[PDB]
Each structure stands twice: as structure tokens, then as C-alpha cells.
Design a protein around this ligand. Structure first.
Ligand code: GGB
Length: 582
């Protein structure tokens, strides 16, 4: 059946009701918001607010309370509204049908937590992680990965078709010295696949030679020209270096549970040729100091698309990239998950793209999802540079250390030696990030994100186990619960079970908002809000003598399951893999 965006529903029935009360008005505000207080109803409509101000005139100000009246007067029949109240000025407070909420709570237990999805299959392309080959994958790359994996999942769950592209820096000029060095240190690479160790100790070996030996430097620069010329021997040496890089990288994408089509800058070697010609032939190119540059009317900087020496650039690659994503992949939306240091870069690229006619931003969504830098607690850059695998190993350890109080004796081997340990570590590292606005800088603290209390993954993961233990400890297997759900009316007479009930149905309205601003932290803020609504429900209501059985209220067994299902999905979107026991 799939869940209902209640906010979008109330917006439909108010726009019907507003068109009736003021049909001569054009595009009136349909600001419907959840009431975050018991008395004011379950949703609020602040629409007589902006409607009064549209009718405002030099010497006449229509009082909003009289509008709200004229609005409620024409409210159609529905399936979700009990009564309507007017407070203050023209606030319209809305009360939901208990029946409606109950029926909806049920529907997601039998049909399950799934979204309605679309009437057209749009194609979202998400550009994330993107480390630079031969250089360490750094924490800023980590954010992108985490944020990108989660964004990809939100659209995947929303019914979109999603292309996860790892746009890796595998076409740098630094390959020159690596390849030239590889040919020195391992003169049989063509035949004996060379044992290159740590790619960082190798790179170091090169930049020394580069900065030291002048005849080596020239060789290095020549290798780049030869590589771009697609030379057989030189290219093989390149493939082999990216190979050693690729398998160290997968160790990380594996641990963080991340799927990615690798499609580096090198993928566009030929399109770049055509792009340069395509900008030339439309007269957008200007020659400055031997560079072919492009000025975009409005932008603070120019794109360099050919250097003085014939070599392409980041701008060249990202121009080729957006043309093919728009034309061959035929995307309806493109998302770039890249550190905010490069904000200007994408606004100029996107501009350049409109300028040459590649897309109509009214029609195709192109979006830079930016993020702040990673800091230590001393509120400056995060360094020691930190290897990502080290960070995670140091996460796994710490996660384990916590668990030794004293759960190594309760949970069995699997439930703990992985399940709880890993699900907590990786879960915290993702959650600490996503729970904070992606734009603000991020303070990476093992101590803060591993805290057993507060707004951490740790608390919410533990919290999850308790919701699951309830119907477990009272011995009600899945088979029973599914039959209960199919036959039980769900009861919401008690205040705190009404809070929890409508909090639950807010899941769609939450995710929709995130499809528009890509602010995932409002989902974490929702998992915490849901999680807290539950405790307040549990601490007063009974689900389950002073001898054994305190009777089972089967409908509250289902409430617990509703809460569980929705947290389960919310976790999945965020990239958290919850355990049951811990
Ligand atoms: N420009 C695109 N498509 N992705 O960003 C690439 C990130 C780059 N490799 C870096 O090191 O920042």
C-alpha cells in the first residue's frame, strides 16, 4: 500500500479549501507543519499568514483570523481530519482522525515500510567519495563517501534509479613520476606484475627523485604526455599502479558497506578532446599565456581547459563528465558530494554548462552537496595525514573495549565478535557525521560519538535492541506478530501512545524534505525524536505476576514493531547495520 506523506496530503486539502475561499488568488502559501506540542493539534497550517499579506494594500490590512475562517469554511471532506482550531492570529490547528492514524500504523506493519515512489522513473547520478590515486584517501574523502552512500540510498528507497560513480583522480600529472619510477624500480612490469608495497612509500620515493634528479624530472613529464597519448607500455604501467591502489581502497569501501562504479577522470580522455573543440567552435574560448581558458559571464574565475603545454585539466574532465551524464546517461538529476573548498569550481562549471546549452536547470536538477572540513577537538585541521584504515581499526578497538563491560559473556561469538562491535563502530563513524549539518565543519571525536548516552549511533543502536527485546522476551515470534497485525485494531487512547503514533507516520514527510535539501541530519534528528517518543511511551504504558505473566496488550506489541520497522529503514538509509541483541 505504502506510507502517506501527511504534510503533502494536508497541503492538497487546504489548496482545495483555499481555491474555494479565494479562487481569484494565484499561488497562495500552503505552509503545513507538524505541531510540536500536544494541545495545538498534530499539524499546523500557517497559510492565512501569507494570504493576508498578498491581499495587503496601501491603506487596508485584512485580518488573518477572518481569512482562516473563510478557509476552514470551505474545507472539503477528507479521510484524515477530525476537527480544526484557530489560535492567535490565523493559525489553523489540525486534529487527525484517530481511525486514520490507526489504520496507517497497521498498513506499514502488514505491507511494510515502503514509499509510494514516482509516476516516472527519474535517473539520479551521485558523484561521491572520489579519492586521488597514489595519494592517501583522506577524511574529507571519507565524508563524501559516507554522505554519498547515504544520499544514494535515500533516492534508491524513494524509487529513483541511482548511479553511484566514484570519480577518482586517476589522471593526475603525478603519475608521470610514478610510472617513470615504476619503470626504474621494476623493469619487468610488462611481464612480472610488480610487487609495489605501500603506495605512499613508493610515491615518496618518486617525489624525492623528482625534486632531486633533473633528468628524471624531464622523463616524468614525458611519461604523462605519452600516457595521454594512450601509449601501450606506459598505460600498462599506469593500470598496474591504479590496481595496487584499487585493492587498498576496497578494504575501505567493504568495511563501510559502499557500492561504487569506478569512473575516474581517465574515463573521459576522448570526450575531453571534443569538449575543447565544442567550446572553441561556439566561440567561448580565449587564449591567455598559451592556455585555452573560458570566461563565464557572471563567474568570479575562468575555467582553464587546456594548459600551455597541451595538457587537459580538472575543468576539462568535469566539463566532459557533465556533458556525458546529461546526454548519454540522460540524467534527471546529478549530485556532487565534494568538500566545500571546491564550491566556486562547481558553480562555474554548472554555469559553463548552461551557457553552452547542455541543460535547462528548470528541467534538470544539478546540485553541489557541499561539506565542511574535518577537525580535531583543538578546532583545527585533522592530521598526524591519517590513513583511513587506521582510523577504522582504532574504531573497532574502541567499540570492542566498551563492549567488555561486560557483554562478552552474554552475547555469543557472532553476536559480539562482529555483530555488536562492528555495527557500533562503523555506525558511530557514519552517524556522528550525518547527524550534523553537512555544511558546518565536523569535529571527529571517538569519545563523543562512542558515548553510550545522548544522540549517538551507540545509544540509538542499543535503544533499538530494547524495542526488539520487548516482544522477544514476552515470547511472541514473527509469525504471531504478523497475524496479530493483520487482525488487530491499534489503540491510541492514551496520550503518549498518540504522540508515538503520529511521530511514526512522519517518516515520509521527513524523507521528502531531504530529497529537496539533501540535509540528512534531519533524519538522524528524527530517529532520535522517534527513539525518545518510545521511551516516554514505555515508561508509562504497559505491554506486559508477582508470582510470570502480566497480560500482553497485543496492540502495544505492534506499536513497538512499528517503531522498530521505521528505525530499521532510517538506519538503512544512513548506512547503519543494526543488531538485535548487543
Ligand atoms: N569533481 C568530481 N566529479 N568529483 O570530485 C573529485 C574529488 C577529487 N578527486 C579530490 O581529490 O577532491
Amino acid at each position: 500500500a505504502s506510507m502517506i506523506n501527511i504534510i503533502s496530503r494536508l497541503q492538497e486539502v487546504f489548496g482545495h479549501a483555499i481555491k474555494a475561499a479565494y479562487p481569484d488568488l494565484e499561488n497562495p502559501p500552503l505552509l503545513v507543519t507538524p505541531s510540536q506540542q500536544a494541545k495545538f493539534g498534530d499539524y499546523q497550517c500557517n497559510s492565512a499568514m501569507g494570504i493576508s499579506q498578498m491581499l495587503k494594500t496601501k491603506e487596508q490590512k485584512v485580518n488573518p483570523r477572518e481569512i482562516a475562517e473563510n478557509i476552514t469554511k470551505h474545507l472539503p471532506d477528507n479521510e484524515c481530519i477530525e476537527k480544526v482550531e484557530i489560535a492567535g492570529p490565523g493559525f489553523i490547528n489540525v486534529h487527525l482522525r484517530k481511525d486514520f492514524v490507526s489504520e496507517q500504523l497497521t498498513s506499514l506493519l502488514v505491507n511494510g515500510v515502503q514509499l509510494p515512489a514516482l509516476g516516472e522513473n527519474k535517473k539520479v547520478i551521485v558523484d561521491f567519495s572520489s579519492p586521488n590515486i597514489a595519494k592517501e584517501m583522506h577524511v574529507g574523502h571519507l565524508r563524501s563517501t559516507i554522505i554519498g552512500e547515504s544520499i544514494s540510498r535515500l533516492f534508491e528507497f524513494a524509487g529513483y534509479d541511482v548511479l553511484r560513480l566514484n570519480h577518482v583522480g586517476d589522471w593526475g600529472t603525478q603519475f608521470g613520476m610514478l610510472i617513470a619510477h615504476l619503470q626504474d624500480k621494476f623493469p619487468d612490469y610488462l611481464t612480472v606484475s610488480p610487487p609495489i608495497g605501500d603506495l605512499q612509500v613508493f610515491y615518496k620515493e618518486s617525489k624525492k627523485r623528482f625534486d632531486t634528479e633533473e633528468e628524471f624530472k624531464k622523463r616524468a613529464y614525458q611519461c604523462v604526455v605519452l600516457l595521454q597519448g594512450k601509449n601501450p607500455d606506459i598505460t600498462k604501467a599506469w593500470k598496474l599502479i591504479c590496481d595496487v591502489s584499487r585493492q587498498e581502497l576496497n578494504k575501505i569501501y567493504d568495511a563501510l558497506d559502499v557500492s561504487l562504479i569506478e569512473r575516474g577522470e581517465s574515463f573521459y580522455q576522448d570526450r575531453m578532446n571534443d569538449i575543447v573543440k565544442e567550446f572553441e567552435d561556439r566561440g567561448f574560448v580565449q587564449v591567455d599565456d598559451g592556455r585555452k581558458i573560458v570566461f563565464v559571464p557572471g563567474c568570479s574565475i575562468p575555467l582553464t581547459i587546456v594548459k600551455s603545454d597541451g595538457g587537459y585539466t580538472y575543468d576539462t574532465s568535469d566539463l566532459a563528465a557533465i556533458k556525458q551524464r546529461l546526454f548519454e546517461e540522460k540524467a534527471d538529476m546529478i549530485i556532487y558530494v565534494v568538500d566545500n573548498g571546491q564550491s566556486v569550481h562547481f558553480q562555474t562549471i554548472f554555469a559553463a554548462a548552461q551557457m553552452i546549452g547542455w541543460y535547462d536547470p528548470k528541467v534538470t536538477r544539478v546540485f553541489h552537496a557541499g561539506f565542511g572540513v574535518v577537525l580535531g577537538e583543538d578546532k583545527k585541521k585533522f592530521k598526524t595525514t591519517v590513513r583511513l584504515m587506521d582510523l577504522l581499526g582504532e574504531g573497532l578497538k574502541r567499540s570492542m573495549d566498551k563492549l567488555k563491560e561486560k557483554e562478552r559473556d552474554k552475547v555469543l561469538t557472532a553476536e559480539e565478535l562482529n555483530a555488536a562491535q562492528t555495527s557500533v563502530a562503523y555506525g558511530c563513524i557514519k552517524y556522528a557525521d550525518l547527524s550534523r549539518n553537512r555544511l558546518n565543519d565536523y569535529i571527529f571525536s571517538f569519545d563523543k560519538m562512542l558515548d553510550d548516552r545522548g544522540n549517538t549511533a551507540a545509544y540509538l543502536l542499543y535503544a533499538f535492541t530494547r524495542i526488539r527485546s520487548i516482544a522477544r522476551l514476552a515470547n511472541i515470534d514473527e509469525e504471531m506478530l504478523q497475524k496479530a497485525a493483520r487482525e488487530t485494531k491499534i489503540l491510541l487512547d492514551h496520550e503518549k501512545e498518540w504522540k508515538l503514533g503520529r511521530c511514526i507516520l512522519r517518516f515520509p514527510e521527513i524523507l521528502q524534505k531531504i530529497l529537496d535539501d539533501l540535509f540528512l541530519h534531519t533524519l538522524c534528528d528524527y530517529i532520535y525524536e522517534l527513539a525518545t517518543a518510545f521511551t516516554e511511551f514505555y515508561d508509562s504504558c504497559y505491554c506486559v505476576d508477582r508470582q510470570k505473566i502480566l497480560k500482553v496488550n497485543m496492540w502495544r506489541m505492534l506499536l513497538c514493531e512499528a517503531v522498530a520497522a521505521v528505525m530499521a529503514k532510517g538506519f538503512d538509509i544512513l548506512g547503519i547495520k543494526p543488531v538485535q541483541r548487543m
